[PDB]
Amino acid sequence: LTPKELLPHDSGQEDNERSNIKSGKQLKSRIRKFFASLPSPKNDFEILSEDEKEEDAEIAEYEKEEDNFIEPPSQDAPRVSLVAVPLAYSTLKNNPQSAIDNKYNLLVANAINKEPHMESRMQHITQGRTSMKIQFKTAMPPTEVLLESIQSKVESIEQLQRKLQHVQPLEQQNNEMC
Amino acid sequence: MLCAISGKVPRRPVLSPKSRTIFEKSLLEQYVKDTGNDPITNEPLSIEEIVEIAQQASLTESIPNLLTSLQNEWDAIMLENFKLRSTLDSLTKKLSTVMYERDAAKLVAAQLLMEKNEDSKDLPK
Amino acid sequence: MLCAISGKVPRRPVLSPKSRTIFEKSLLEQYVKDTGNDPITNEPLSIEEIVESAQQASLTESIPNLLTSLQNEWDAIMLENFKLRSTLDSLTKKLSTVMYERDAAKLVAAQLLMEKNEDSKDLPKS
Amino acid sequence: ESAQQASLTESIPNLLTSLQNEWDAIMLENFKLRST
Amino acid sequence: ALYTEYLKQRNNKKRRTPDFNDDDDTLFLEEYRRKYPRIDTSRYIPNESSEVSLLGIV
């Protein structure tokens, strides 16, 4: 028994296994793909599900870290979450059609709320004022960096365009005299 | 009748062979020059794969009004494009709020089954 | 601007009427005196077939190029809608399955709060 | 059976200012040409 | 008629005119300004990528 550069490969593999369990069992939505902290909205939404809405609001404030972070004693989850997902899947052509009908009702509700809009008007002009601040300053930087280089060669373009209108006027009086 | 990229009535339509879809020659070429793929089924397709496949002229009305008509239609299309983008970002945002509460509820089910397991031990004693 | 045979800047351009391509006169004449052909497509072409009015023209600058410009504006904006429409059929398909598994799990949460409270109601009375 | 036109740095104007000048210059020239 | 009168048909300069805290039709106007700025930045981004080179070859 003589290990050499094996316990260092085993400690790295044990660290690579522990990092795979912590990244996977951290959060389901945060690890996959893509909010402001608001305790006043959790207090106003208490009056909904009325028990699970307060459980999901505290789970959103804990995973994001007027904001206080309290309990990361929530997510050793990875074996209890596998049994909960397999138990919930067992309780769950006809199901595929009822989901497509509800998705068309939600798409018709999303097209109705957008049609009625086109308080909220003051936020869109302020987003435009942020856009008119950002893009037009980026435009004036891209225009003046271009106009230091293009207006020199616009004069190389336009004055040679003026040579064509005199070469054409001398061509017609010469072809007339020919 | 409709190209399934822009929805225009195609004036030089081309059909893809990897997926059954009649596209427009100009729009499908710009997609293939970006990435060598089919926009619907994401299958590997090239420009030589395309097979180049009703024309009714609009007669609008009985010229300065046609200038402001074009001005209105580009004004409407810019808003009919903008409203369909903010709708996409908010339905993805409201899908994200459902994904947190789906994973938070299956953690609340873990403590509720523990209260049922603790109760089943007490009922047996 | 270039000659297709040599690659130089032609000082006497002549265009052939069998395969349209701008050839230099002294180069293409030697090609025709070699064999009576057009060097690109190998079709028959003679010296009189190669050729070097009143409406004055102006340079191609940013009516016709303005109409072809607005084609590029809209054909690009049409692809921008497809990036949106294809992403909408992915998020709404994922929303249909997420709202379904939310509707299927909340019936189990409603029964566990019943069963864990009924078992607390049963045990404390005993 | 390529030409390059460098679009201006200040390229709204293609709808408003460029398009009016194209149909002004078409209108005034042909009328002056009928006068010619 | 336009050349004989010497008068040009007016274009819409309403997009320059728009103002904050206005009605629902002007809310359409300010969102029109946002779509025009995103298009203008995209058009300016192509010119920057091309460089003078494109003005040089013409």
Curated annotation (Swiss-Prot), chain A:
<comment type="function">
    <text>Involved in pre-mRNA splicing and cell cycle control. Required for the binding of the NTC complex (or PRP19-associated complex) components to the spliceosome to mediate conformational rearrangement or to stabilize the structure of the spliceosome after U4 snRNA dissociation, which leads to spliceosome maturation. Its absence leads to an arrest of the cell cycle, possibly due to the inefficient splicing of TUB1.</text>
</comment>
<feature type="compositionally biased region" description="Basic and acidic residues">
    <location>
        <begin position="6"/>
        <end position="20"/>
    </location>
</feature>
<protein>
    <recommendedName>
        <fullName>Pre-mRNA-splicing factor CEF1</fullName>
    </recommendedName>
</protein>
<feature type="region of interest" description="Interaction with PRP19 and self-interaction">
    <location>
        <begin position="109"/>
        <end position="127"/>
    </location>
</feature>
<comment type="subunit">
    <text>Belongs to the NTC complex (or PRP19-associated complex), composed of at least CEF1, CLF1, ISY1, NTC20, SNT309, SYF1, SYF2, and PRP19.</text>
</comment>
<feature type="region of interest" description="Disordered">
    <location>
        <begin position="5"/>
        <end position="24"/>
    </location>
</feature>
<comment type="similarity">
    <text>Belongs to the CEF1 family.</text>
</comment>
From Swiss-Prot, chain D:
<comment type="subunit">
    <text>Homotetramer. Component of the NTC complex (or PRP19-associated complex), composed of at least CEF1, CLF1, ISY1, NTC20, SNT309, SYF1, SYF2, and PRP19.</text>
</comment>
<comment type="similarity">
    <text>Belongs to the WD repeat PRP19 family.</text>
</comment>
<protein>
    <recommendedName>
        <fullName>Pre-mRNA-processing factor 19</fullName>
    </recommendedName>
</protein>
<comment type="function">
    <text>Probable ubiquitin-protein ligase involved in pre-mRNA splicing. Acts as a central component of the NTC complex (or PRP19-associated complex) that associates to the spliceosome to mediate conformational rearrangement or to stabilize the structure of the spliceosome after U4 snRNA dissociation, which leads to spliceosome maturation. It is also probably involved in DNA repair.</text>
</comment>
UniProtKB/Swiss-Prot annotation, chain E:
<comment type="subunit">
    <text>Belongs to the NTC complex (or PRP19-associated complex), composed of at least CEF1, CLF1, ISY1, NTC20, SNT309, SYF1, SYF2, and PRP19.</text>
</comment>
<comment type="function">
    <text>Involved in pre-mRNA splicing by stabilizing the NTC (or PRP19-associated complex). As a component of the NTC complex, associates to the spliceosome to mediate conformational rearrangement or to stabilize the structure of the spliceosome after U4 snRNA dissociation, which leads to spliceosome maturation.</text>
</comment>
<protein>
    <recommendedName>
        <fullName>Pre-mRNA-splicing factor SNT309</fullName>
    </recommendedName>
</protein>
